Amino acid sequence: MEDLDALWERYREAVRAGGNPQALYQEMVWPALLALWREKPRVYPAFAVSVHTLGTSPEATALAILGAGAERVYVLHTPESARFLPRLRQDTGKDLYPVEIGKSDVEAIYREVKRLLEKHPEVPVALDLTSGTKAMSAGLAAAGFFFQRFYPKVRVVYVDNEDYDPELRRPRAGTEKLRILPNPHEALAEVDALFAKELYGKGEFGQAAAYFRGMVGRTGNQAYALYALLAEMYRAWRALDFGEALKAGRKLLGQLSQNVWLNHPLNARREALEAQVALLEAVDRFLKARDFALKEGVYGLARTLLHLAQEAKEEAAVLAALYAYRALELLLQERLALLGRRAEAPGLSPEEAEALRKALAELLGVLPEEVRLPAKLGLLDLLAFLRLKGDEALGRLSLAELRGLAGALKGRNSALLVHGFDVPSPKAVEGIARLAQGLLQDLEARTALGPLSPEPVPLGF
Amino acid sequence: DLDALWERYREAVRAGGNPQALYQEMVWPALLALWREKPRVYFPQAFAVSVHTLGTSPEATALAILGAGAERVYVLHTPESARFLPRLRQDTGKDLYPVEIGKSDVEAIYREVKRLLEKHPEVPVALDLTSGTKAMSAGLAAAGFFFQRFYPKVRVVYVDNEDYDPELRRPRAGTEKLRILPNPHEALAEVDALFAKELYGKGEFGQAAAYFRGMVGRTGNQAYALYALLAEMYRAWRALDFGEALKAGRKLLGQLSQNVWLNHPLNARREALEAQVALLEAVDRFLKARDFALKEGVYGLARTLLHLAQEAKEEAAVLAALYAYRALELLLQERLALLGRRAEAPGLSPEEAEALRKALAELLGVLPEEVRLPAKLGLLDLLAFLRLKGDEALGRLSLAELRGLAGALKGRNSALLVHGFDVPSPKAVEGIARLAQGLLQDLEARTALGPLSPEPVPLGF
Structure with a gap:
């Protein structure tokens, strides 16, 4: 090594005397550097395959081949750098599997890396980008970091160095070291x-x-x-x-x-x-009280459910219907609480029950005698009852809109995830959510929470 | 023109002149002029910001800056390439924002690119990798393609060429062109x-x-x-x-x-x-027939719901309870059908109703008068009724097991997403789902499907 540092200086002073750079590098420096890398590769801390771009200087690639120490060596070369494959063979003693690519055909680099990883899918693979054009080197690195997602044993490697002389177009002999270039997740924590x-x-x-x-x-x-x-x-x-x-x-x-x-x-x-x-x-x-005097909590729950129904409208229509039905039910029950009454025990007088059967019959296209009022008011019974009692918000509903929603409201408990097998049309769920939204805006005006969204706050980074 | 200029340059070099000084004197002014007049840029692109690595080759970075045409120009240089910043200012005529980095410090590339994208988050940004070490160029490309996920308007760019003379270490003048390097996702369909x-x-x-x-x-x-x-x-x-x-x-x-x-x-x-x-x-x-003689469909629906319940149990127990309750309900109704009773409205005699009230009271640890039987049997009512009628599967449950299930079973309709306000524990869902699973295993043997899973088949590639 100090032999190498001494002959590096001998080489430098011979160059300043007029000796040719490349020739004296080949004669004085490269045999000792190569012998060092044969005996003892300068490698940072396993490879079964190595893949190397090859530009106009074969020495870096020879070193990277020896440093990776892979059994199987692929060389991505161009029509112009094919001339250096014999030297690579004689300096490394390796069988080379060459693949010709254009010097800035980055897509072809990507495709060849794909093909090679599919040929060697579960072994450590070194992707050496030291030699070649920036397009070849950057394409190899990009392909490596992309494919690590699916081939985690892939590593991008580089013959790093210290004293690159721009005149000599080479680093100081003995400072070369093969090392792994980290991917961004590995490299930068934030x-x-x-x-x-x-x-x-x-x-x-x-x-x-x-x-x-x-x-x-x-x-x-x-x-x-x-x-x-x-x-x-x-x-x-x-x-x-x-x-x-x-x-x-x-x-x-x-x-x-x-x-x-x-x-x-x-x-x-x-x-x-x-x-x-x-x-x-x-x-x-x-939720703890279950009492509709707690307007802010009714609002918060109905708002949450309507937001969930809007998000489920595309990918989860059955859930969207469930969320929308529950929100509308809550809001209608709160309207009933404005009258001092409870849907599970509304205390209908005989006159009120008769009137409600008549109104439901008109909405359902049946005779009043076919209408049977359950002990607990269903969703459509509750809407019809509020209209009978002159509820101002439900009174504004047109008869056409209510007839359009009657099938969906009637089938609340017949939903697939409640007691039945039905899924209402997305158009009906849209109408149920619209009705609920109008009732929600009425409630929102009457609550100390004001208008509030479940949308998440921006993170601030 | 530039062709004849390149031949005059090569001739003057052949005649013993200094290749680099002669490039600066004979070629570089015409090329720089041409990139100021009409830069050779492959489909024409509009960048607000450009970011440039800088090695020992400032000419390439000048061409890249002029080709990108960005108002704001950042230059990622090393302590060794800093001395080139003045000349780069003169060639481009731009105010340069310099950022120092080590020549192999890829983490530093990632960090500084991240800072600059945070400073310019919504504008098209060019990352030019032409000049610098391979670690710098590959680091910039890798950073670019990684950050494209989060900053879609980033592009990686490169001053390519048609021909490059390896002796002169220069592209053939006038064959340079600024190109976008494609990311591996967009270049490889497969x-x-x-x-x-x-x-x-x-x-x-x-x-x-x-x-x-x-x-x-x-x-x-x-x-x-x-x-x-x-x-x-x-x-x-x-x-x-x-x-x-x-x-x-x-x-x-x-x-x-x-x-x-x-x-x-x-x-x-x-x-x-x-x-x-x-x-x-x-x-x-x-689902069309809604009739519990169709055992295969009952099995398929209950199996699907139990799979969804198991999937939702840990992080979405409200929804998991909804799925698991429906699955259990279906299975209990099928077992009512299997007993020869109507699965949707079993007709309980007054003697059967009295016996069921007694059995539920003994179970619940209350008095018989405190049990009310709704017109629709709840899950617990239905389970107790099946036990009274001699159902063997359900007859095998112990009193301890039944009392452990009783709270969840009573809460079928008081679930938040049905009619009530209950927010369940994943442990209660687990109990319901385990009871349902046993009934499902019994129905499996009585169906023409046999045992089947909603788990997806392997793709086979």
């Missing part, structure tokens, strides 16, 4: 936040929380524990577990009020978070 | 299958179908259309849209029967597919 943020923006709150919690496990940065709490709060809220959501939100607000978290980015949104936690509190209170 | 197969493996059937549809177009290969149908069938099945699931499964089976597709990989799992489609057909039949 990029995990990006994955978490993406999942959060998709409504995948449980996975987002898992990512944030794993980041605290990786780096110890407790700022991401607060983000995990937030994602956990939304996970629980979207799953209708208002107790767990309230607990997570209260923990989060408590943490954000500590001096150490004063500049956490979620504090830029504190009021929004406080309002959402107030909503969760109100819903928790209403 | 990779979409791997993504689909990943999504399919995680049960994301809609996205898997979407990727399969994409592949059909980008390749010539209608084979992927079959995969798309399979994914659509599972999507519809999980969403409880049995009609659409059956439509897709029948279309798929009919295509797998054509001569062209006899070697399709799905035909390796043909038997399983056929069985799943028959289950779907039986469920579709049962």
Whole structure:
């Protein structure tokens, strides 16, 4: 090695004397450097296959072949650099499997890497980008980091070096070292936040929380524990577990009020978070009481259900119907509470029951004698009853709209996930959600929560 | 023009002149002029920001800056390439924003690119990798393609050429052109299958179908259309849209029967597919008839609901309870039918009603007068009635087991998403689902389907 450092200087001074650079490199330097790499590869801390781009200088590639020490060696060369395959054979002693590519045909690099990984799918593979055009090297690296998703044993490698002489177009002999170029997730920790943020923006709150919690496990940065709490709060809220959501939100607000978290980015949104936690509190209170005097909790629950129905409208129509039916039922029951009455025991007088059978018969296209009122008012019975009692919000419904909704309202309990086998049309679910929305805006005006959305607050990064 | 200039340059070099100084004197002014007049840029592109690595080759970075035409220009240089910043300012005429990095510090590339995208989050940004070490260029490309996931307007760019003279270490003048380097996702069609197969493996059937549809177009290969149908069938099945699931499964089976597709990989799992489609057909039949003599459809619907309940139990227990209650209800009604009683309105004599009130009281630990029998039997009422009528499966349950189930069973209709406000424990869902599973295993033996799983068949690639 100090032999190598001494003859490097001998070479340098011979070049300053007028000796040719390439010739004296081949004669004085390269045999000793090559012998060193044969005996002892300068390799950072397993490869079964190595794949090497090949440009106009074969020496870097010879070193990378010896450093990876793979049994199977592929060489991605161009029509122009094919001339160097004999030298590669004689310097490495390896069988070469050559693949010709254009020097900036990045797609072909991608395709050849695909083909090779499919040929060697479960062994460690080194992708050496040292030699070639920037297009070849960058294409090989890009292909490697892309395919690690599906071929995790792939590694991108590089003959790093120290004293690159721009005149000599070579580094100082003996400073070369083969090493692994890390992928961005491996290299830069904060990029995990990006994955978490993406999942959060998709409504995948449980996975987002898992990512944030794993980041605290990786780096110890407790700022991401607060983000995990937030994602956990939304996970629980979207799953209708208002107790767990309230607990997570209260923990989060408590943490954000500590001096150490004063500049956490979620504090830029504190009021929004406080309002959402107030909503969760109100819903928790209403769920415990089951009493429709608690207007804020009725609003919070119906708002949550209508938002869930809107999100399920495309991918989950059966659930969308269920959410929309429950929201409308809650809102109609709150209207009945405006009259002091309860749907499970409305206390209909004989005159009221007769009038209700007549109105239901007109809506259902039957005779009043065919209408049988259950002990607990069904959804359509409740709507008809409120109209009979002069409810101002339901009185505004046209007869055409109500006739259009009558089939869907009548079949509330006949839904597949309640007691029957039916799925109403998406158009009817749309009409049920529209009716519910109008009742919700009436209630929203009468509640201390004001208008509030379940949409998540922006993360602030 | 530039052709004749390049021949004059090569001639002056042949005559012993200094290649680099002669490039600076004879070639570089004409090329720089040309890139100021009309830069050679492959379809013309508009960038707001450009980011440039800088090695020992400032000419390439000047061409890249002028080609990108960005208002804001960042230069990622090393301590060794810093001395080139003044000349790069003169050639381009731009205010440069320099950022220092080590020549192999790939983490530093990732960090600085991340900072710059955060500073310019919504504008098109060019990452020029032409000049620098291979670690710098490959790091910039890898950073670009990685961050495209989160910053879609990022592009990786490169000053390519038609010919490069390896002795002069220069592109042939006037053959340089600024090119976008494609990311491996957009350059390789076939990779979409791997993504689909990943999504399919995680049960994301809609996205898997979407990727399969994409592949059909980008390749010539209608084979992927079959995969798309399979994914659509599972999507519809999980969403409880049995009609659409059956439509897709029948279309798929009919295509797998054509001569062209006899070697399709799905035909390796043909038997399983056929069985799943028959289950779907039986469920579709049962949903139209709503009659518990159709044992196969009862089995298929209860099996589907129990699978969904098991999937939802841990993180969506409200929904899991809804699914598990429906599954258990169906199975108990089928067992009422099997006893020869009407499964939707068993006609209890006053003597049977009295006996059932006594049995429920002894069970619930209350007095008989505190038990009220609704017009529709609840789950607990129905289970106790089946036990009174000598049902053997249910007769095997112990008193301890029944009292452990009694709370959950009484809460069928008081579930939040039915008529009430209950938010259940995953433990209560587990009890309901385990009772249902036992009844399902009993019905399995009495059905022409036999045992079948809603678990997706392997793709076979």
